[PDB]
């Protein structure tokens, strides 16, 4: 069957028994930087299995009035294992990812999620004179949440699914690598993101390569007398992580 | 001199271009490159999905 | 060529083949043709996708700014004008480029320079044909503080001199980003702290255009307005994005106001 | 090509080789690469030194003077203007050439000629399009003393005639020093006594440009200003010098005022 | 006619020049000569100094 | 000349212009563990240049009445860079070292030091009923000091150079890899220690593979009117560091 899969990376392994294939974003599979595309002249450290391995993030509760969740990368893995340690000590990094979303339910539950990895998901702001602040772009391992309707603030992110937090049709986030999790079909999504940037390597705190957004397009619904807590778990492994520009820890 | 076909119909038909500058940024824009590869957006899946078969077996 | 697929003739079917049925839970989108859902005839199809190339789409000159300056300094325009180079002060050109995340291209800059007579208490005007300078100052160059200063000597700064009543002047510019492509959207900050400017304006640092009259002022007043036109050439674009839904607010931010997805309909069933 | 060196991969070392240690008491400067002081990867490097050639550095037109003349003689400009040819009245172009002691090059001279209306008690102006002459008089030629004199017959003197509303006129000039290169700095005197002019101005003797209106004066007044632009071409330069630190004082001397080496810092340790 | 490569990238690309004048001072500037010899400023020493060895033995 | 040397490891390099060769301890140069001597079945991470690179420790003041100093390894590098980070997250590690001691002086100063790396330098205790405590075995990047004469305490290390803190002749610490720094000859010592243990890998906090001891055998002496502060600096790089048994950070 096509519904059963395992992905083994490092000392971690994930199993699925319902899945709707694997999306390889832009048809490019993660790899180390070549000698003809390099520009950092020091030897790169490649920690291999010690950084490339699934890291489970904090789970979010799917409710009937939920409007979605987002996690920015690499800043959701900034405190995760030795992946986050090698971010501390290095000026440059460069990594692809396999992102795996889990959300099982019974056959008497219904709902549909869009799972999409958006490169360069620069976000708007409630006040038009101000930039959104870091605390509102990022929650780390915890997700930031979309809201159903428009919000107000000064440095708050403008959240409202219809605009997707970016001023674009939310229905058009399908030219970006994506899968859907529809509870009557599959219980997992898998996206494999290559490294995508216009520079061959970049700092891992000052820049977010992509944002994973999970947006309900068909609300959660079930008859009362069924399970009322349904989590969505995001477990994501780095792939081909390498770092250059070793110096003391920090980022300021 | 470079001699290349013009855009023409449907059911003479060449033009001549000579570059006059030492930079390739000075050159006229390339408008006759019609290569495509829609499959990296339209079919970006690890396993090849055959149309006639079930998506999910 | 850019020619599209032919329709293939197809007869009745009754098989366990199911081209119509699919799962959209895969990121894959269906590859169905009309030759899978009904009879169909063979159509030899000669239509081309020639003009839907990104090097034909983006390769038409678009106005990006205009800036005014005045001989008299009549209405607070100074004797020279300036513009920090960006592509984001105009809605139309900006939207086309923001359907992509990274673009590398060469530009072609055309200038349409016009002048007009101003109200004055001066009597008797017989002002010579104006000459104008357009000076490009790369980042970290000295800048004009007056129309007469040493910076207009243009010893290394690229410059155009052009006289009215002649064809619009143009110059090519090559690809010139620090990166390997221009960045339309940057989800980072300019500080490692994660403070300062946020967005694509962090990576914007493309110099400044200055423009003056070269002629000394005459007893009346003339205001000249220069309109700057950029045309992408030799383009490669990467990472498609949605077209904008919302109107822009600012030329350095994406901040947006919440707007409707689509326009109204009376009901689900309309004719 | 002008392509730069590749980085070479290098492993751990422990040897009596000492690339890092050197003596700077030799005039020789170290040839160390990153591949001598740390690990390093192989980087195939495609960067070029193409635009840092001396024939790209010096080969952009720079204004060297402007001089004014007036039909009316309104504000003491005479009916013709003159300029003794030199490259030292402008800071920017001068500094670039003074990074070398000897330069042989051809020049290209472009003129940007503009006119403007002047205040007058004249009424009704409908002045025809001006024509202008630019005459080069080699050393020891007869010189204008008026706008009408016999010297403007240009029987052997090179000359340009140009009408306003047209493209800037230009002419090439070949290498034309008495020596085998132009001399930017001369540590000698013009006399064997060791008196007279000292410095590079001893060897300066490059003729004089004269410029007039060719049209007879009209009842108002027009002042025309001509800006002269030199561009080196086909350059060979010899004996590199430091760039200038001090601002210039004079166009015939190097005299200078004592100035700071660099700008301030608070302390030895700054961030 | 002289046919010579243009400046172009990185990972058609020729131009044609004909000289129209009887002087070589009239010609366009040579911008594509990229020859170098830094060693007469950077290493102007009588005895060749090998990098790995002591400067002064 | 034989007096000039460089050692390049990672993005660090040391230069000497007076040295008395390099001692390769037991004639064995650091290497990764082979497949025929392995017993940990998970893939080893080998961080290469990111962990193998000189780390300068805190300097000690050589005085005329100094009796010596010691630093235990790997516990002097436990907070050093990503070498110390990979100690945190891994059950096992395994590394060789190059240890480089620096101590220059004028030609009007005299003194002699023994620089010796002692495998398994288990130490005695002042009280004969008690074991020495961790705070007295180890100072981390800071050295613990030998004393000229016998000390007392309850959990204090018995320090007295004559016994070398181990109950053996101090003059017999010359069958262990060693060099001397004699101020009229050389200003540096270099020892290259292989990994030496009776197990192929071991935990890096619970065990100290060797101890570097620096012991004056000829006191510092100089005529008053000369420099009176002379440091001894120990700069030590890991070599062929690899780790197995990835889990959460800590050591308890």
GROMACS .gro file of C-alpha atoms in nm, chain C residues 34-166:
model
  133
  343UNK     CA    1  -1.074   1.646  -2.198
  344UNK     CA    2  -0.964   1.311  -2.349
  345UNK     CA    3  -1.031   1.146  -2.012
  346UNK     CA    4  -1.380   1.274  -1.933
  347UNK     CA    5  -1.561   1.266  -2.267
  348UNK     CA    6  -1.532   1.152  -2.630
  349UNK     CA    7  -1.318   1.426  -2.793
  350UNK     CA    8  -1.183   1.462  -3.146
  351UNK     CA    9  -0.823   1.515  -3.250
  352UNK     CA   10  -0.744   1.886  -3.266
  353UNK     CA   11  -0.405   1.989  -3.398
  354UNK     CA   12  -0.341   2.295  -3.187
  355UNK     CA   13  -0.095   2.565  -3.293
  356UNK     CA   14  -0.146   2.805  -2.999
  357UNK     CA   15   0.171   2.920  -2.824
  358UNK     CA   16   0.263   3.025  -2.472
  359UNK     CA   17   0.515   3.265  -2.627
  360UNK     CA   18   0.389   3.587  -2.467
  361UNK     CA   19   0.332   3.423  -2.126
  362UNK     CA   20   0.707   3.380  -2.077
  363UNK     CA   21   0.846   3.574  -1.779
  364UNK     CA   22   1.080   3.758  -2.018
  365UNK     CA   23   0.783   3.900  -2.210
  366UNK     CA   24   0.563   3.952  -1.903
  367UNK     CA   25   0.819   4.162  -1.717
  368UNK     CA   26   0.982   4.315  -2.023
  369UNK     CA   27   0.777   4.627  -2.077
  370UNK     CA   28   0.883   4.964  -1.939
  371UNK     CA   29   0.695   5.081  -1.631
  372UNK     CA   30   0.715   5.420  -1.458
  373UNK     CA   31   0.867   5.383  -1.110
  374UNK     CA   32   0.875   5.746  -0.993
  375UNK     CA   33   0.875   6.105  -1.098
  376UNK     CA   34   1.052   6.386  -0.916
  377UNK     CA   35   1.044   6.761  -0.981
  378UNK     CA   36   1.297   7.042  -0.953
  379UNK     CA   37   1.279   7.410  -1.037
  380UNK     CA   38   1.516   7.681  -1.159
  381UNK     CA   39   1.340   7.944  -0.949
  382UNK     CA   40   1.269   7.711  -0.653
  383UNK     CA   41   0.911   7.838  -0.693
  384UNK     CA   42   0.718   7.581  -0.491
  385UNK     CA   43   0.979   7.413  -0.274
  386UNK     CA   44   1.129   7.178  -0.531
  387UNK     CA   45   1.495   7.294  -0.494
  388UNK     CA   46   1.728   7.330  -0.795
  389UNK     CA   47   1.785   6.957  -0.808
  390UNK     CA   48   1.585   6.650  -0.714
  391UNK     CA   49   1.675   6.316  -0.566
  392UNK     CA   50   1.532   5.967  -0.547
  393UNK     CA   51   1.652   5.669  -0.345
  394UNK     CA   52   1.628   5.382  -0.596
  395UNK     CA   53   1.358   5.123  -0.529
  396UNK     CA   54   1.077   4.959  -0.729
  397UNK     CA   55   0.813   4.978  -0.458
  398UNK     CA   56   0.663   5.328  -0.484
  399UNK     CA   57   0.439   5.227  -0.775
  400UNK     CA   58   0.164   4.966  -0.745
  401UNK     CA   59   0.167   4.820  -1.096
  402UNK     CA   60   0.536   4.735  -1.150
  403UNK     CA   61   0.573   4.625  -0.789
  404UNK     CA   62   0.289   4.373  -0.810
  405UNK     CA   63   0.433   4.203  -1.120
  406UNK     CA   64   0.772   4.151  -0.952
  407UNK     CA   65   0.614   4.040  -0.624
  408UNK     CA   66   0.471   3.733  -0.797
  409UNK     CA   67   0.823   3.597  -0.750
  410UNK     CA   68   1.046   3.589  -0.444
  411UNK     CA   69   1.381   3.614  -0.618
  412UNK     CA   70   1.451   3.777  -0.953
  413UNK     CA   71   1.784   3.829  -1.125
  414UNK     CA   72   1.768   4.059  -1.421
  415UNK     CA   73   1.939   4.344  -1.599
  416UNK     CA   74   1.748   4.673  -1.620
  417UNK     CA   75   1.710   4.934  -1.888
  418UNK     CA   76   1.640   5.282  -1.756
  419UNK     CA   77   1.466   5.533  -1.982
  420UNK     CA   78   1.402   5.889  -1.867
  421UNK     CA   79   1.122   6.110  -1.996
  422UNK     CA   80   1.216   6.463  -1.905
  423UNK     CA   81   0.975   6.750  -1.963
  424UNK     CA   82   0.969   7.113  -1.852
  425UNK     CA   83   0.698   7.373  -1.820
  426UNK     CA   84   0.683   7.749  -1.772
  427UNK     CA   85   0.589   7.879  -1.429
  428UNK     CA   86   0.402   8.188  -1.314
  429UNK     CA   87   0.631   8.480  -1.244
  430UNK     CA   88   0.629   8.859  -1.232
  431UNK     CA   89   0.907   8.844  -1.495
  432UNK     CA   90   0.844   9.010  -1.830
  433UNK     CA   91   1.006   8.899  -2.156
  434UNK     CA   92   1.111   8.534  -2.171
  435UNK     CA   93   1.326   8.383  -2.441
  436UNK     CA   94   1.487   8.106  -2.240
  437UNK     CA   95   1.737   7.876  -2.427
  438UNK     CA   96   1.679   7.501  -2.470
  439UNK     CA   97   1.741   7.335  -2.133
  440UNK     CA   98   2.010   7.076  -2.072
  441UNK     CA   99   1.977   6.843  -1.776
  442UNK     CA  100   2.208   6.607  -1.594
  443UNK     CA  101   2.101   6.278  -1.441
  444UNK     CA  102   2.367   6.148  -1.204
  445UNK     CA  103   2.376   5.805  -1.042
  446UNK     CA  104   2.560   5.800  -0.709
  447UNK     CA  105   2.645   5.442  -0.589
  448UNK     CA  106   2.608   5.375  -0.208
  449UNK     CA  107   2.854   5.570   0.009
  450UNK     CA  108   2.932   5.832  -0.257
  451UNK     CA  109   2.927   6.209  -0.187
  452UNK     CA  110   2.585   6.367  -0.247
  453UNK     CA  111   2.468   6.710  -0.376
  454UNK     CA  112   2.378   6.969  -0.113
  455UNK     CA  113   2.338   7.236  -0.381
  456UNK     CA  114   2.317   7.252  -0.759
  457UNK     CA  115   2.664   7.410  -0.784
  458UNK     CA  116   2.875   7.176  -0.569
  459UNK     CA  117   3.173   6.958  -0.664
  460UNK     CA  118   2.974   6.632  -0.673
  461UNK     CA  119   2.833   6.713  -1.020
  462UNK     CA  120   3.183   6.677  -1.170
  463UNK     CA  121   3.097   6.306  -1.217
  464UNK     CA  122   3.454   6.178  -1.219
  465UNK     CA  123   3.357   5.816  -1.150
  466UNK     CA  124   2.979   5.849  -1.096
  467UNK     CA  125   2.784   5.738  -1.412
  468UNK     CA  126   2.599   6.030  -1.568
  469UNK     CA  127   2.377   6.127  -1.861
  470UNK     CA  128   2.368   6.473  -2.019
  471UNK     CA  129   2.065   6.533  -2.238
  472UNK     CA  130   1.909   6.835  -2.411
  473UNK     CA  131   1.532   6.881  -2.464
  474UNK     CA  132   1.375   6.809  -2.804
  475UNK     CA  133   1.561   6.481  -2.849
   0.00000   0.00000   0.00000
